[PDB]
Symmetry: C2
Subunit: 221 residues, 2 copies
Amino acid sequence: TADQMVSALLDAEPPILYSPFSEASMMGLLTNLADRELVHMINWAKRVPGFVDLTLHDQVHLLESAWLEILMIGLVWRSMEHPGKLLFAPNLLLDRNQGKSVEGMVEIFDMLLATSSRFRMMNLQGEEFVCLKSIILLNSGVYLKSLEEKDHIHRVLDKITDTLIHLMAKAGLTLQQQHQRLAQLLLILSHIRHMSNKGMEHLYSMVVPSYDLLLEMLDAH
Amino acid sequence: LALSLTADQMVSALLDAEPPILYSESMMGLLTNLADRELVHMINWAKRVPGFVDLTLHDQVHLLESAWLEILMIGLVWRSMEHPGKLLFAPNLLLDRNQGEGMVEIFDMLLATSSRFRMMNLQGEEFVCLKSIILLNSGVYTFKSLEEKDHIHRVLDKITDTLIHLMAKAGLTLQQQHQRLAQLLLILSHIRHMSNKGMEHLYSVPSYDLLLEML
Ligand SMILES: O=C(c1ccccc1)N1[C@H](c2ccc(OCCN3CCCCC3)cc2)c2ccc(O)cc2CC12CC2
Ligand SMILES: O=C(c1ccccc1)N1[C@H](c2ccc(OCCN3CCCCC3)cc2)c2ccc(O)cc2CC12CC2
């Protein structure tokens, strides 16, 4: 049910990781941190309900599409209550002037600040965050076995929608406010997809976990 | 002022605002020429979206800069819906996957979005609602300024109520309503992905002044 869905997602949540400050080592610090987050992200995805029911190959493809989005929404969430700053790590808090070093970095940095500000204006809750995060993992790459795979992903996404509505109903929101907030939340995902693509372009101008690399982390013994 | 229309009145204003289907006049000169001609009718459609002209001209242009490729794509996806395996760019330009460097990637994504619309039985009054959400939402995060974004979010909220009212009219349960709403808005995230990849593939853009003058 929605309550067991929330609890599983709240319990599957990964930990917050840590990184004279040097501007030149910034991209080094940020790369090392994201490489370590990827490991815990693999563990988190395996505990999202319905994810491991999928074949190993579609699990990789799903993670291949969403990994940057997921890193970004977690960054936006960690930065939600520090206006104007991104909290990459508790010991790595940056403002937009520190992003001016790399070319094309401050544009993505401003889009992440607008999203964190948008979460603030919405007063996003942690139970809603883990729901959106899980939706990113299942929806970003979903567009005979593949018919069965896709129908299962959409059934799980259906359960998460009902979970979102249930948290909104438990919060006392009206039925009209429930539809409106759900729409407001899922519309932010289009912008997160947008940032991930701009960030993907920015990473190639200097990088992506390979299929063979993601499969090793997913395929356990 | 425009936030006073009923859900039925909102549907009718969007249905009456739909642009015409244009015709094609080297396969890529025709796609560019087609897209340039569709852009003018898109501006006139955007002006008839309830609440759009209530924004300043500066913010109207910014919304159109962000959403124009998405709106052309969802319109193409809508036209190709009844044509499996092919995209209907124009009634005299019906292309297949084999007619498509970097083009078959985007072509496949459009074909998959069209097929997703088909098995969802996307309706016309639902489609016109999804197109107005793209126009208002695609640029609201990259902008008095706060009054404008409050207005955009108010109108976006009315379309949500409009979409839910259409699903309720059709006999869907409340649970089926939330699930269909979520399903449709999750496809917008993919259209945005195609527009991004399309923009990179085109780079491999209408100016502010041009959009302003067509307005
Ligand atoms: O610096 C930036 C940034 C911020 C603002 C504007 C432009 C860029 N980023 C950081 C990052 C760094 C490298 C990386 O790719 C590394 C290669 N690759 C090699 C092995 C496989 C996986 C990684 C991905 C993300 C990072 C770190 C932690 C975090 O929580 C989130 C992010 C987000 C982000 C994308 C926005
Ligand atoms: O060909 C393609 C295509 C299709 C499949 C795979 C790859 C590419 N496209 C066509 C197009 C062409 C040029 C253009 O940009 C032209 C510059 N021009 C643009 C504004 C003003 C000045 C610059 C935009 C869109 C087009 C036409 C009509 C339509 O309904 C939809 C589309 C869709 C689309 C993006 C997918």
